[PDB]
Subunit: 92 residues, 3 copies
């Protein structure tokens, strides 16, 4: 699986959530951050299966972009293990 | 080494800290986050040696779980380098 | 590219920003975090080309250190993909 970090404009969060939900991604973690005096941003983190990474990245690009400055970046990371606390089950 | 991200219920932080301290892990970084309208969560990040990753994951699972919905996830990442700012010493 | 996470004392942020700007690094994401009852810290995240990782790490070490306790750590991660939301262009 991969972790996708998207740093976006705060008012683009509901756009991105809505569009991701359409391609079936709903679980996400959101952090308030400062982007560099600074601009408030939100950091979206979602961990998804490898075969939907492209769909997710593309979806975030399409929805979060304004064509203007400050639209933000997407960072994708390899994830070694994913464990559910409820059950102890590993990876997904 | 590995970085362990645990997204948990906020009132489970002291449980997890206490239990980790028992197996000798005390250094951690904590972030307030929103989990998906949303529920407040805390993100615990700890960077540990490879041979205690299992112990830590298991400890977090045992302490943070409620058997119910919302218990959260653990994400484990490879860490390329770990440097101490005090001394410049690399990895651990 | 690599992602560099530096957990530092909050009043060291402008020091680090200023010094990084000198070696040409200006884009960064900053998060308020708690370091372990706890001390307020700031988490700096910057994603940089491989050949300036050493320069950046060294710069953060030199500027952020006080020689005393609590100076913090630098964690370096491999980054699979970096995508700009404005253009959809991948990696850098
Ligand atoms: N190297 C980096 N490390 C961590 N975060 C970054 C980095 N570069 C940019 N960011 C985050 O991205 C935000 C700015 O995005 P950016 O302005 O680069 O968008 P863009 O898609 O390149 O559009 P434009 O270039 O037109 O502004 C910053 O607020 C910052 O939080
Ligand atoms: N794909 C993901 N990316 C980032 N964060 C996530 C992801 N999935 C879940 N989370 C975080 O985990 C929290 C929810 O955990 P979750 O409800 O999945 O726990 P669980 O152990 O699966 O228990 P249950 O399935 O019974 O709820 C969310 O609030 C969110 O912050
Ligand atoms: N294993 C870890 N995982 C995540 N964050 C950590 C970890 N260890 C330390 N940190 C972060 O680093 C901060 C403390 O840094 P630390 O005190 O280790 O600095 P140092 O350079 O080792 O100096 P000294 O050892 O003299 O205090 C903590 O507040 C915490 O947020
Ligand atoms: Mg909107
Ligand atoms: Mg409690
Ligand atoms: Mg200062």
């Amino acid at each position: 699986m991969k972790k996708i970090d998207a740093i976006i404009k705060p008012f683009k969060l509901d756009d991105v959530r809505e569009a991701l939900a359409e391609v079936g991604i709903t679980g996400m973690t959101v952090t308030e951050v400062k982007g560099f005096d600074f601009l408030p941003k939100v950091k979206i983190e979602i961990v998804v299966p490898d075969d939907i990474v492209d769909t997710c990245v593309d979806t975030i690009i399409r929805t979060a972009q304004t064509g203007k400055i400050g639209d933000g970046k997407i960072f994708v990371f390899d994830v070694a293990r994913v464990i559910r606390i409820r059950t102890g089950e590993e990876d997904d």
